[PDB]
Scaffold this active site. Structure first.
Site, PDB file in Angstrom:
ATOM      1  N   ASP A 162      83.412  38.986  29.832  1.00  0.00           N
ATOM      2  CA  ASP A 162      82.666  39.888  28.951  1.00  0.00           C
ATOM      3  C   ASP A 162      82.992  39.633  27.479  1.00  0.00           C
ATOM      4  O   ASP A 162      83.116  40.584  26.681  1.00  0.00           O
ATOM      5  CB  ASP A 162      82.936  41.360  29.332  1.00  0.00           C
ATOM      6  N   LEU A 178      86.254  29.813  28.557  1.00  0.00           N
ATOM      7  CA  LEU A 178      84.906  30.380  28.641  1.00  0.00           C
ATOM      8  C   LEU A 178      84.603  30.826  30.071  1.00  0.00           C
ATOM      9  O   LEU A 178      84.865  30.084  31.020  1.00  0.00           O
ATOM     10  CB  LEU A 178      83.884  29.352  28.183  1.00  0.00           C
ATOM     11  N   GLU A 179      84.109  32.063  30.200  1.00  0.00           N
ATOM     12  CA  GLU A 179      83.505  32.573  31.440  1.00  0.00           C
ATOM     13  C   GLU A 179      82.258  31.792  31.809  1.00  0.00           C
ATOM     14  O   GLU A 179      81.658  31.100  30.972  1.00  0.00           O
ATOM     15  CB  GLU A 179      83.178  34.080  31.312  1.00  0.00           C
ATOM     16  N   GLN A 180      81.888  31.880  33.086  1.00  0.00           N
ATOM     17  CA  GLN A 180      80.753  31.138  33.621  1.00  0.00           C
ATOM     18  C   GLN A 180      79.482  31.251  32.761  1.00  0.00           C
ATOM     19  O   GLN A 180      78.876  30.244  32.412  1.00  0.00           O
ATOM     20  CB  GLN A 180      80.464  31.591  35.077  1.00  0.00           C
ATOM     21  N   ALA A 231      79.185  31.871  29.668  1.00  0.00           N
ATOM     22  CA  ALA A 231      79.387  31.311  28.336  1.00  0.00           C
ATOM     23  C   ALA A 231      79.248  29.806  28.316  1.00  0.00           C
ATOM     24  O   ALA A 231      78.925  29.234  27.289  1.00  0.00           O
ATOM     25  CB  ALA A 231      80.771  31.724  27.796  1.00  0.00           C
TER      26      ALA A 231
END
Ligand code: NA
Length: 319
Positions: A88, A121-123, A125
């Site tokens: 998030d 980085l998250e998925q 992103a």
């Protein structure tokens, strides 16, 4: 090959019962991080609600206090990175934002004393906005800025392992930061039954296979450090295995038997592919409690620090 034990530090107050199994992460100052960790990743640089550039501010400290904590850690021989991303994080960098992003990273480094940046980085992103081109380009500019100064702004990354295919989502980050990144610590956790196919054993080796944990750690790493079996190449000297501190820290991937790691590290070295060390999510979890209030009691660092550092002549230390 100077060895690293990397740990993430939470820049927030534990909400309590935040663990995957109902446990609770610990709260403590950054400078109170367990001894043993020699790279500590402040989590996270992110885009705040109703703002548009990723940034960072210490949640519990003035800038002066937080800078002093980092100066103290640095003097103690520890590196402190800022981790970009997390869940998030709303990281959506436009090409138009590159200069501002570069200036903000420089500002954070000079304000607080960060020694580098970890790309976490998250998925969502990974391919968001112009992230894939702006982040590497900006980071090259930052690195070169500090190089002109005789300083090494460290760049690391924490890719989830399934994205590490030759032409996968992550490839641009790795390919475009070749010669700039110091090491990559992929997450060998939170991917359930995913893993890799081993043609010699005729077997799928999953990340949640406890019986074959050693072969999972060895085989995934060997593929990555050789760029084989469809995986992108990351030199072994720039490679770090990322693991959960315990079963509260991550849904899956916790290593029940540390000998699996020891044996995997020894087999990598014996194959001519000695790696740089280990990473964990997270120092706050390693000091946390399970649902019953029993202390995790720094078992990850107490286990893996001596593994990496006893009788090891090359121990990464800040400056
Ligand atoms: Na510093």
């Amino acid at each position: 090959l100077d060895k690293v034990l990397v740990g993430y530090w939470h820049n927030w107050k534990s909400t309590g019962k935040d663990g995957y199994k109902g446990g609770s992460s610990a709260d403590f100052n950054l400078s109170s991080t367990q001894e043993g960790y020699n790279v500590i990743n402040v989590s996270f640089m992110k885009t705040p609600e109703g703002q548009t550039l990723p940034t960072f501010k210490p949640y519990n400290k003035t800038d002066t206090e937080f800078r002093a904590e980092i100066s103290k850690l640095n003097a103690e021989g520890k590196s402190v990175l800022i981790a970009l991303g997390g869940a998030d994080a709303h990281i959506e960098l436009k090409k138009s934002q590159e200069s501002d992003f570069v200036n903000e990273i420089i500002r954070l480094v000079d304000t607080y004393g960060f020694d580098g940046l970890d790309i976490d980085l998250e998925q969502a992103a990974i391919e968001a906005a112009d992230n894939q081109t702006v982040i590497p380009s900006a980071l090259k500019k930052v690195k070169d800025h500090y190089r002109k100064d005789g300083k090494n702004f460290m760049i690391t990354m924490a890719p989830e392992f399934p994205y590490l295919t030759s032409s996968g989502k992550y490839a641009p980050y790795i390919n475009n930061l070749d010669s700039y990144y110091d090491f990559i610590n992929p997450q060998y956790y939170n991917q359930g039954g995913d893993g890799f196919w081993d043609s010699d054993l005729n077997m799928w080796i999953s990340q949640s296979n406890d019986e074959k944990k050693e072969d999972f750690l060895y085989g995934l790493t060997q593929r990555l450090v050789t760029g084989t079996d469809g995986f992108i190449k990351i030199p072994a000297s720039k490679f770090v295995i990322g693991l959960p501190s315990n079963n509260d820290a991550a849904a899956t991937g916790y290593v029940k038997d540390p000998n699996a790691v020891k044996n995997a590290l020894n087999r990598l070295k014996a194959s001519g592919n000695e790696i740089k060390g280990l990473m964990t999510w997270s120092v706050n979890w390693d000091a946390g409690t399970n649902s019953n209030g029993e202390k995790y009691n720094n078992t990850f660092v107490n286990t893996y620090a001596p593994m990496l550092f006893n009788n090891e002549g090359h121990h990464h230390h800040h400056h």
